Amino acid sequence: TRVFKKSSPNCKLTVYLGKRDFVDHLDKVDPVDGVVLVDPDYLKDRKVFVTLTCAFRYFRKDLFIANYQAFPPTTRLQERLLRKLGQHAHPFFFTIPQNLPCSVTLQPACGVDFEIRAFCAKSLSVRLVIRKVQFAPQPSAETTRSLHLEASLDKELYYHGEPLNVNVHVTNNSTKTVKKIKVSVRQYADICLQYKCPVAQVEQDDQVSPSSTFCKVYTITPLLSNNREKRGLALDGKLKHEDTNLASSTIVLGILVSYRVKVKLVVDVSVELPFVLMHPKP
């Protein structure tokens, strides 16, 4: 059907790759299988190798590298790729170890990214940026400050963009009057070789009088729209300056991402609920 081609300015070397996003099922990553097309004259003696970088940046903390000899020799998609090219097309096949920082970066260089590097040399080039990706596979909180605050969420998996509905129940038996209620989202993106991130904040002047019950639902939605002027924000892997989502919620070695909805009463008893913010597999 479709395949990604890339060759050097000399073009003597080409790499054909089925995908440029690799799905980490958490037990078997989509193996990086591609095909190297070469001309015998431009290589002659020198060998040809292909490498799978697992860089970590911020600093080039290249957390992993592995080499495959395109030539000398050492799948059906590779078969079909070869049938159109001949002998001088040779397959490479890396297997991604799962325990890698799944493709993520930071919104401005920094970040994390795999890479397919094909090069011809006698001894140990096309630079194909790839990514590892993960697809999305009932928190409840009660606090008794008596100023009782209870928060709940419909479910723990909220697709990117999908709005989050927070059930708030405030039983104010104390003498302090609530001046605001804030349902906010904190996006914890810890660079482990963690920071509070205010993205969405539905501040409502919903005041609950003494010995009174205030029960209702907020709807707050995290969107990249207003998260544009947020440096250090964790985005998903950007292949060549596209645009992408908010760094999906990691399912736990590099950058760790979690998300929490914080219900805070401005009297400041606060509670928090962790939720998942990953895409759905089509």
Binding site: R2, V3, K5, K6, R80, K84
Partner: peptide, 7 residues
């Protein structure tokens, strides 16, 4: 740069 041939 990265062209794109069908198949």
């Amino acid at each position: 740069k990265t062209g794109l041939t069908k198949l």
